[PDB]
Write a protein that binds this ligand. Structure first.
Ligand code: KR7
Ligand code: MG
Ligand code: ZN
Ligand code: ZN
Length: 334
């Protein structure tokens, strides 16, 4: 079993890693094994003096607080986002741009970015006056929760993977991670994109040049957001699994809404769905504009990704046998 898992992990630097296969092979520990592998590849254990047993212990704990019963926002998604971020960080256009701390921050942010997700949206949690929305005053509810849990777990037995950073490194890392995970709130998408556009419009090269924290963090925020929205850019056999999972999760939310006598949210009604037209819309209004801008920023490194995305769009379009627009307006605008 171990041998086969090792063969699959050889694709860790490649877009299109077989993450589901890794999940089955690892006993449903894709986050732990992927993070460990990445930490080895990038030499982050040596650089930040992270004892290996402490890493494994934190990763297993973090993984356990992802909900296996949630079809999309689970540990497999977290592993995917981590690995996608890891690839993006290695793009030629960003060679030697980020420090090791900034690299650690982006990867860690990716690992924790949806931890303890309950399988329902911010808007559902607000509309039901949930405990979470009450705790966080209706703003970036889940994202604030992912951060609090992700950090709190460092305090469990033998979990403090940052015990040998300096006080200043710990503060800087904490701040970057917060900035990154809060930018994963989907309602911030337009603002992020506008900023990313501006950065492209004024980019300097020699490889990209980034003079200040503000510019660097912005790129990391967009990078992890791209990773979060990367499913339609993946080989189609992966994409389609992600699509089935997110629709399952949406339909379960709609069943909860139905049982409570609420209006069923867009995309959440299993009795009235258009899976294929909705993906086309998702790509045209959100994913393609974002990734076309990321591709400009890193031109020409992301060309294959863009091409796959455009092929994947045609496929969903070719398999077609108000809701999309309502979902977009409610999800991706501030
Ligand atoms: O954060 C939130 O408030 C809710 C929310 C926003 C973004 C996502 C990601 C996602 C979204 C979609 C999708 C499906 C139908 C329509 C549209 Cl517009 C997008 N699809 C996929 C795909 F790629 F995995 F299939 C993934 C999941 C939840
Ligand atoms: Mg999230
Ligand atoms: Zn716990
Ligand atoms: Zn996510």
């Amino acid at each position: 079993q171990e041998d086969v898992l090792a063969k699959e992990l050889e694709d860790v630097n490649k877009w299109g890693l077989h993450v589901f296969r890794i999940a089955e092979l690892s006993g449903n520990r894709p986050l732990t094994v992927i993070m460990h592998t990445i930490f080895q590849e990038r030499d982050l254990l040596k650089t930040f003096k992270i004892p290996v047993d402490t890493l494994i212990t934190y990763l297993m704990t973090l993984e356990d607080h992802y909900h296996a019963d949630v079809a999309y926002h689970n540990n497999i998604h977290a592993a995917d986002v981590v690995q996608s971020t890891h690839v993006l960080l290695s793009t030629p256009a960003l060679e030697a741009v980020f420090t090791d701390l900034e690299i650690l921050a982006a990867i860690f942010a990716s690992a924790i970015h949806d931890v303890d997700h309950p399988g329902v949206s911010n808007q559902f949690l607000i509309n039901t006056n949930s405990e979470l929305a009450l705790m966080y005053n209706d703003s970036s509810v889940l994202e604030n929760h992912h951060l609090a849990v992700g950090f709190k777990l460092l305090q469990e037995e033998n979990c403090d993977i940052f015990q040998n950073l300096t006080k200043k490194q710990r503060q800087s890392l904490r701040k970057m991670v917060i900035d990154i995970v809060l930018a994963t709130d989907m309602s911030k998408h337009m603002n992020l994109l506008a900023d990313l556009k501006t950065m492209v419009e004024t980019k300097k090269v020699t490889v990209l040049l980034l003079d200040n924290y503000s510019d660097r963090i912005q790129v990391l925020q967009n990078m992890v957001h791209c990773a979060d929205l990367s499913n339609p850019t993946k080989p189609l056999q992966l994409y389609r699994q992600w699509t089935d999972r997110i629709m399952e999760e949406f339909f379960r939310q709609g069943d909860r809404e139905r049982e409570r006598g609420m209006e069923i949210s867009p995309m959440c009604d299993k009795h009235n769905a258009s899976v294929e037209k909705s993906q086309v819309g998702f790509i045209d209004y959100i994913v393609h504009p974002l990734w076309e801008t990321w591709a400009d920023l890193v031109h020409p490194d992301a060309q294959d990704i863009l091409d796959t995305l455009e092929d994947n769009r045609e496929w969903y379009q070719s398999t077609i046998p108000n809701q999309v627009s309502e979902f977009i307006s409610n999800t991706f605008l501030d």
